[PDB]
Symmetry: D3
Subunit: 272 residues, 6 copies
């Protein structure tokens, strides 16, 4: 009867999605796989990230937070398997920044594909790699590795990898360079095409609160002891009939340069 | 010479009691069993929850935070053992919500006791179960289990359990239904009858600060751009010669419905 | 030249079983803190530590020469590749005496009967949808699969699916989840497979060397040296050309480790001083 | 029918000791990830993994047929139940060769003398107040007990109590806590006990089967096959009807695993080529 | 090319130095040994505390946060080894409170040194112990222990220890008394003599921001419903042409005693 | 009297190797939860569990009588003390058959040649600067050392140093860090050393007792009892005065555990029924 919501069991997303949900006014004791809300008629489900698109696609669950990377991978696999693939995206969150990018041995040499026309590429996202390669008309053999994909070249397991990266720290750590960005992933909140009776009312309520909480998180109340400074976005007494960000020493210093005195930044719990 | 305070070694209560104490102005580096306060003449003692009532009852310690569940269990056991049982309760905290409740196999059948007149009941709180059963005039055999009590029926170890539960998640997880609530526990701060010389001065100081910190935790400063909205409890400029809670989107939205503009909620660190 | 690559589980009992057996095969190596690629200093060998799921595909891809996996994992990815029209070929060498587990359909304890018949509407939750599909198709029953990669038994409770096919060794886990076992749709043990491609020569020489030592190690585990203060060949038949000389008590080698039951059985026949000594290693 | 239930520690050395011994008794099972109830596929048996404290009471309640516990835990709950006027009866079967520990009264190192006398005012901290009470009452000394379920040695330091009775194997722990051992008030080893009730028949048949294999396993652990390039029976008395034939060197079975000291002693007597080989399993 | 900053791999300092750095406006995803800042041209290096002075001394790194205890130990060892010892201290942080102090068996007897003229002293900081002893003209043998130094007397490993202590809890736990404080350590931010081109500009920027963040951390905005109370440091409307600390119930109560009404304390995110 | 103190690693394979060997030497003790000082109830002994770095210095200081350490750790602190003009003397007793590792200079894989020559400017990162100094000085090459106490291989990547001397068993770790091994500047195994001072008498008696049992344990590990259905002494030379009597098949004791290769070699010579049985313990 209730609204079912799929979330990662483990990882930063689980916490990000738990915390945001808390902020949205959903009361729930920290999860150990099916959780019931005492605040509202909602049930969280904690599962592996990979399982989430398919469950929404199957309509097992109404609602699911996943990375676009995970979402397109299983979407393509199902298409290949001629399996039910349909779903409804609602909102893209500002958490879940990562790229699937082709990386090669540092001191290795190339300038685009058809340098990769024979090589073995190691990936946890073989379908996404296949998509890009096929469209590029380059031919390739995939080495399926679900963990330690960067160690594949060293091992001599494969010639190259497509690895999920946020920043080069991992790659530089594995003695590789990033050569192409073949997918840009952000975490998105999707809906089950054919899992759904005025629970849509609940869904609109959720979506609206998400933004408000986003605003309060981003925004800060400023107080400070001409108009260029007024046009700096600071709002002690703003125009009747608070900054979106303004979170940097530089603009604080920039304000100080403009002659700004008593620069006080306070946290906004919540706002509209 | 100093004021001794018994607290749980491990669990949420330890953190809750540590944090609250911090808020009460007691300076102490995070505990590894006896702790001395540099702020004030106080010593924390970290021990198993079960040991706490008995130590206060023995007067080994002046002061102790425990669940009422733990407190009555050892109180009854000592009575049975004809052991010293006396103590002084001071305050019941708003943390330590749980119930000891009799739970049965789902798809199992009953409608009150004397359906339990022969069954084996598994419990970590046998004295508390005995109290309720005896008063109900129902006869029973107890299966003493100090861990994984919910697995007893499955195992065929016992016919039923009384299990400590906060919400049915655990029970539903173990394929059982809750049938009776035989005890309602909250965490309470008690005092040693006959462990105590103007340290009572210190005790009054502690109790007063607890409430103030409770207020600041609960309460929030609101600012917002007829009287029904004034009677909504919001306090931008309240009547000279701040909300207790007001922490819900609904009332925010309800305020928005009343035409409320620039709804800003800020945290209160501390207040009186 | 090229070194002999062996794919093994990173974590789990198999990894230990495959590590230990390899030790007994005389291959000098040490895990000495987790690392993906390991070299033996005793022999020209590299172990590779990876998820069990990765193993069939790597051998199928020829990334690695040699791989120990559960038959369950092996058929699943074999069928998925076939469906994906991917290279699926490999060479089986030996099926090990360990990795004992069954993929079996389990139902809510209360829910009952048919046990194979019907289930033409209900949702079955599995990590092995391809193996489930194989059995279902052959049974002519129509499925909806709920893909879950862990905690599959919690699916019914959750209302995620009507039924599961769960990997079980004992059934306690199903018993633990308040479900009954209804069918055994696949029987799995660990098997040692080989690359599809050209086996070089001295690599293949090394492979024959490995296989014969593995069997020898299997023999020594199974076989024990016996002595007993016992002329009745029926008791000798209780211990199956075992020789030795000596009322009369002789030192036979038995093929298979004797059971307490058969140990007792000798005692019932009037056997005294039953001494079983362990064989470290042997070669028939 | 009903399966044979065996209560064992969830965690600790005993759990491993009781698991391993059971393995050697020929009972096929695998922990294979923590779970409260375990089934043997070799025999009709279920292990139950629980806190050591729960074990006497479960056997006393008859919830389970069979239980391995420390005598310390066994007497404590036996006396507590008696005090509570609760069912206290059970059947002991065998006392194991492991679980060696003593509940002993220890005092501040500096504090000294009497060591049994007086202590008519001082507070003693214990997890085993009933065992402490037994000894104190018999000594006619008057007590105040400080109940602590862990870190009992820290009580004096804390000023929680004047003295402790602490479970010790070595005393390092007391030495570690800056205390001296003053009395040994109880001597504990692990014992195997049985349900108070009606033992059915084939259950009891299975129980006899278990006990005799356990002893056999005990024998094989204790006993070793010997050979030595040695006609002096005094040396034979150093190895206690051991036979064999052959200056002259023969292959005797010794009852108990020979010590390096006694090994050396043979060397002193002029023994050469002392070969000790392990017996996997045997039956007198 | 970038500014290299050495920090502890593990321990409270790592977190303290990570968090402070975050506050200073350095954007960096939580570290796994070399870290690159996306906010600014900076690289953090995570290493054992012992390695830090030597790396700055070698000029491998420009910048390093270490305890003065660690800093003088390796400084003296290098001097003894006739190794490069030079460096530039910049700021001493208000985190890293500890003392290396000589502690003896409780119920053991002494009143200053030459009671220690023969004894074995166990230490992880043998050079620092040697410095103090030599200057005192007392003779001694050092027992080098890198862990569990307090257990040495009990063991009979050594007659005495010099142990790093924050409060006696550890010592009292090990049945020892503190007899002398032979070094007072605080965590300090030092600079490489000869590791350094207008990156000094970056260094001045860092140092200035550290103080500002220190102020905001310490300071709180107060609002409350004669001049003695005005001279209590509280600042609702202070003199045109906010408290440094004021974080105690006592002064709150003291304010209440002066007749103070509506005492509200709010957190300051950031200020100048 | 004074008890015999033995310094051992708190954590690592050596601690287990030294614990296990000591067990086999007949010394009764149990770790039974981490603690710095351990007492044997079998013999008058105390084990001390400490960082490997602390061990040479404690023996050198005479704090402890007896210590198992890697020669690498032993020479490092020996040289550092010499430089510090600190007491450096000790007595070596035996070098163990375990602790196999090399301190070797490794360079960026791409970077190549000289491999010992030049490096007169480059920075080398090490936890063992004194050992590096020894080798460099003897080579007449001039160094700058980067002291790192862990993750030394990450130094080049970091740009912390130009090169490393890293402790390696296999080289996988260097291979893992994208570096090549260029020189082996020190060869380390675990050795058992002794206090510099006056060895009392009965302590020293106990020490002789320990050393002879350790060797005996070494022998039993190395040596195996053989039987084979084989009159060709060349095959007997394949198994090195081994006796026994019996085409003809006899039970020789071999000094060293036979290899599968030599096992096979017998099979090539026509050997049948190769039975190797483990020797628990023995005394030549």
């Amino acid at each position: 009867q209730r609204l079912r919501i799929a979330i990662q069991k483990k990882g930063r997303l689980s916490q990000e999605c738990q915390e945001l949900l808390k902020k949205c006014g959903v009361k729930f004791n920290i999860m150990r796989l099916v959780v019931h809300s005492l605040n509202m008629p909602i049930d969280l489900l904690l599962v592996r990230d990979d399982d989430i698109p398919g469950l929404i696609m199957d309509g097992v669950v109404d609602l699911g937070f996943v990375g676009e990377n995970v979402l397109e991978e299983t979407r393509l696999d199902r298409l290949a398997l001629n399996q039910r693939n349909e779903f409804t995206t609602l909102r893209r969150m500002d958490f879940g920044g990562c790229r699937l990018s082709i990386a090669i041995e540092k001191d290795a040499e190339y300038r685009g594909p058809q340098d990769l026309n024979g090589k073995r590429i190691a990936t946890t996202y073989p379908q996404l790699l296949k998509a890009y390669m096929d469209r590029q008309g380059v031919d390739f053999s995939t080495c399926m590795l679900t963990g330690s994909v960067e160690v594949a070249p060293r091992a001599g397991l494969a010639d190259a990898i497509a690895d999920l990266v946020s920043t080069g720290a991992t790659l530089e750590a594995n003695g590789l360079k990033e050569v192409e960005v073949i997918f840009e992933s952000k975490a998105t909140l999707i809906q089950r095409p054919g899992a759904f009776a005025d629970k849509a009312a609940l869904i609109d309520k959720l979506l609206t609160r998400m933004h408000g909480v986003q605003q309060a998180k981003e925004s800060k109340y400023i107080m400070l002891h001409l108009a260029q400074i007024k046009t700096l976005l600071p709002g002690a007494e703003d125009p009747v009939l608070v900054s979106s960000e303004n979170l940097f020493w530089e603009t604080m210093e920039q304000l100080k340069a403009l002659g700004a005195s008593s620069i006080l930044v306070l946290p906004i719990e919540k706002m509209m």
